[PDB]
Design a protein around this ligand. Structure first.
Ligand code: GQP
Ligand code: GQP
Lengths: 360, 360
């Protein structure tokens, strides 16, 4: 049975389970169940399922080299599909809440969930809470007697925490750290001293890489009972590296991918985000270029934004991007090789993860 | 050592632990650690600690009838303090996010967290997320090798889910259920057909009673290794009953307790909440009174609000309140008696919980 079809079948199964449990154990009525069904569909479906399919793909690789009864294969694949849905649902939680936080307008060519007429922020904040709570319900129900349950829950907790920390690093990245203060309204950085490669690396490591790459690879390992086929420090290193590369790409596209293809209007420049482009631009700018950057960055006025995009184009950031890409390719292929020492299988799953990321 | 002092000592301990772990394992800087320290203090401290102290009080009761080494007593008390902080922190999460959702202005005589100048909704939504994530960090660190860890985590998950469900019941309570629809902006009920005792009971059961009464009593039991001293159906029943009574009180005070004493300006009437007062009023109203209620409820205009408070005063809701109170006293004392069959100790802890609630 093909992995994607399996994964989608399991969505239906889990959806039905969560809603039936709301009726039998939490006194829900049919109309609020319907509202939550539509919310689940609208917030969890319509992407490529990269995260959750990685869990499946990792598990499928181990199945090919590991003796099991057919029923065990099925159990493992099912677990991998559940686990992948846990991660899809965690992402849905973060997309819902971050859209609200960031005043976002669209997502994937449709309005952000909080912007639907019958939702509003009042409901959407809670809908996002429920999204995450469903991840735990999934685990407790489907993995109740599994030997990996402890480890999976503990990992998932850490990933989720690291992610929330990353949001804090991301939305405060345009403020001077020494002036953070709940009591005082926060000014934008005027010096941009904290727009550095190391700082940017921290933002991106936490904001995305733990849930997007680390958690899908290690959850694959856990449902497979295959933690011993890897040196977990290598897995972490490669996860964080590939994920950085994924985010740099995302940053580039925010500025340069036409809205129709992007699925939304990018506003990094207006929001003064510590983006790859801004950090790299500042890494190579002369005095005049820095000064012009500072006079135009983080302003909604479209003329100011155009001045910033000109600076980017004129600074030939493409070249710095190719150089970065080249190093990352180098360092990923290296990490894969170190991973082949304990598991050619797991190494190959990483290689696929890298290909899907490096091309899109 | 006195229980409250112990409980407060443990706050300091846990605070230091969570922040030190952010520095050693999550790459936090000193200024963002400071921001999270102030957030934790401002969102978790300044209430009466009823929830978390109930865990302690339950545990202290078992210690008085149960042989242990002194070091075991201390371990149990510490666990109870941690567990009580888990519940305080869960409440802090819900207060932060519900203030944002509900457009609230003040809480405990101070501005809601999202309204602090250097916070804003962008940060506050995430701060609330972190608040809950800290509950799990507490558990995983302090209860790592505890025999109750599984059960505590599983219970805590259910409580938290039930609570999020309760928020959904509470904020949609003034909409006709058949017209819930993410696609369509939601009108206020014109008939108020769903302002019934059974519906109201559902809202309040989920919105408050699971985290405020159920979770503190059962967490006391769990840290005590004393689940067998109770018939958990009795515990649930008494929890849900006392908690309902707590919420009815809260509803009354929203309308009639002067803002300075309340700690905030009550706006249930303006927000069209399915409150005890509204349900009871409608339970006894004649045709003219219903019609006047419907012409004035759920409107911000202060004259309309005054018309609603007059209707309440003129309908002598005090009398219905005493009758309700009388029944609840009756049914609580009954449940306590059933609890004495397996544990006079646990029964007495319930009796204290009831006294603190019934008097404030
Ligand atoms: F998913 C994650 C994977 C690793 C880390 C970092 N880390 C390393 N050791 C740890 C012990 C306790 C807590 C965090 C820890 C964070 C999140
Ligand atoms: F804290 C709680 C305590 C009891 C219930 C209701 N309930 C009863 N049995 C259950 C099995 C699975 C899930 C929920 C369940 C909800 C929350």
């Amino acid at each position: 049975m093909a992995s994607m079809e399996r994964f989608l079948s399991v969505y239906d199964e889990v959806q039905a389970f969560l809603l039936d449990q709301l009726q039998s154990k939490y006194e829900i009525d049919p109309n609020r169940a319907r509202y939550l069904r539509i919310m689940m569909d609208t917030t969890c479906l319509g992407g490529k399922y990269f995260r959750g399919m990685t869990v499946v793909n990792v598990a499928e690789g181990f199945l090919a080299v590991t003796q099991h009864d057919e029923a065990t294969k099925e159990r493992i694949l099912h677990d991998a599909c559940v686990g992948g849905w846990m991660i899809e649902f965690l992402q849905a939680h973060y997309l819902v809440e971050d859209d609200i936080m960031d005043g976002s307008v669209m997502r994937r060519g449709k309005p952000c969930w909080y912007r639907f007429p019958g939702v509003t922020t009042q409901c959407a904040i809670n809908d996002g809470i429920i999204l995450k709570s469903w991840t735990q319900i999934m685990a407790w129900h489907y993995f109740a007697d599994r030997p990996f349950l402890k480890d999976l829950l503990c990992l998932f907790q850490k990933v989720d925490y690291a992610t929330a920390v990353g949001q804090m690093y991301d939305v405060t990245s345009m403020c001077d750290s020494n002036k953070l203060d709940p009591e005082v309204a926060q000014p934008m950085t005027t010096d941009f001293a904290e727009f550095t490669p190391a700082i940017y690396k921290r933002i991106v490591k936490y904001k995305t890489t733990f849930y997007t790459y680390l958690l899908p690879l290690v959850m694959g390992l856990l449902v497979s009972e295959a933690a011993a086929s890897v040196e977990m420090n290598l897995v972490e290193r490669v996860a964080h590296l590939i994920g950085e590369y994924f985010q740099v790409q995302d940053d580039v596209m925010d500025c340069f991918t036409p809205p129709e293809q992007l699925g939304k209007v990018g506003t990094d420049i207006e929001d003064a985000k510590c983006s790859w482009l801004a950090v790299t631009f500042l890494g190579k700018a002369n005095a005049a270029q820095v000064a012009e950057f500072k006079a135009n960055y983080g302003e909604k006025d479209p003329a100011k934004v155009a001045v910033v995009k000109r600076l980017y184009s004129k600074a030939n950031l493409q070249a710095d991007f190719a150089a970065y890409e080249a190093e990352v390719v180098r360092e990923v292929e290296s990490l894969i090789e170190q991973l082949k020492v304990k598991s050619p299988t797991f190494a190959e799953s990483v290689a696929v993860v890298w290909e899907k990321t490096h091309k899109r």
